[PDB]
Design a protein around this ligand. Structure first.
Ligand SMILES: [Zn+2]
Length: 139
């Protein structure tokens, strides 16, 4: 699950949303989703989940973005899917280049300590993946 404050970019409108607002309003936005071959596509959100308060850890990515997610949340890495809690400084996660919109890899600059936080989940049509804080994560 992703924490309150997580930014979700809609590739159709160009608007960046905070996940808690997408869930609370059940907003029918589109997000960027990664397909099997690693290409990125625009897909609509089809389910919204308010997962309550849970433990979340943080991953600071090259570029400044910090994604907070439960340690079990799966992240797409150079080595495939891996739980966020297993990642360490130096590991590379798949990301969406903000300028080109293409898939690339970014180094995790830092792992932040666990804390309690409101968490959410979004279901993305067909691809079951989504870009959050620029990082390709599991949906
Ligand atoms: Zn799914």
């Amino acid at each position: 699950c992703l924490a309150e404050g997580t930014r979700i970019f809609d590739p159709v409108t160009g608007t960046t949303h905070r996940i808690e607002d997408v869930v609370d309003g059940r907003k029918p936005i589109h997000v960027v989703a990664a397909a099997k071959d690693g290409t990125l596509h625009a897909r609509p959100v089809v389910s919204w989940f308010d997962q309550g308060t849970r433990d979340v850890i943080g991953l600071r990515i090259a570029g400044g973005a910090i994604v907070w997610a439960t340690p079990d949340h799966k992240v797409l890495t150079e080595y495939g899917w891996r739980a966020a809690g297993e990642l360490r400084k130096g590991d590379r996660v798949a990301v969406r280049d903000v300028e080109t919109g293409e898939l690339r890899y970014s180094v995790i600059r830092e792992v932040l300590p666990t804390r309690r936080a409101r968490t959410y989940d979004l279901e993305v049509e067909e691809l079951h993946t989504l870009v959050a804080e620029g990082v390709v994560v599991h949906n």
